[PDB]
Ligand SMILES: *[C@@H]1O[C@H](CO)[C@@H](O)[C@H](O)[C@H]1NC(C)=O
């Protein structure tokens with residue numbers, strides 16, 4: 001399991017949690033020095049449990065699929081909650097079985113559906129460590145519209161930070177003041193599968209992407225990523241989604 005406490009949190013402690021999260025995801029090889037997530041994992045070993053604690057010390061446990069860093073569902077006191085999608089229903093066979101009650105949320109976990117449920121796109125939702133405190137608090141007691149927004153915050157501040165060093169650093173900058181994600185943040189989130197794929201295809205193609213990946217950079221300008229020498233590959237991306245799952 002991995003844990004993170006908001007009470008007393010600072011950029012250092014958040015970076016320790018993101019490191020723990022990355023290190024809890026299994027891999028058998030690296031591709032251009034980046035851990036390659038596994039094609040498949042059977043049974044309960046598929047799911048990592050993240051223990052998160054709000055400022056007041058209340059807690060949820062979040063179940064994460066270790067093949068793709070997707071959040072499946074979470075436990076809050078004695079109630080479990082799962083996305084309305086087949087991978088999460090499968091997860092519910094293995095995690096949080098001792099909950100008194102299981103609620104299926106009235107949406108899946110992709111960004112498009114969550115944003116519809118929340119009533120806003122994530123360009124307009126501030127993120128940060130205070131926002132993660134708020135999200136944990138919201139998830140403690142069911143409210144499906146509130147939960148969608150909380151879940152957009154939670155996914156960005158855990159999974160997306162684990163995937164991209166730039167996103168981890170953006171959350172660090174928001175340790176004590178929330179701010180809506182930079183355009184580059186959104187770009188990276190949206191490009192993870194595409195990048196993971198192109199980096200794996202570049203092995204066999206001299207480091208060259210078969211199809212270039214269009215991104216927005218740190219300065220808000222629209223760059224084009226064509227090969228493994230790019231900083232996105234050498235510095236930023238920390239985990240690869242296996243092409244077997246693309
Ligand atoms: C590869 O990417 C680098 C870094 O973005 C860029 O300067 C260069 O023009 C590209 N090289 C090739 C061979 O495509």
Ligand SMILES: O=c1cc[nH]c(=O)[nH]1
Pocket residue numbers: 069070071072083108109110111155159
């Ligand atoms: O796209 C998805 C679907 C489920 N859970 C996630 O975190 N992301």
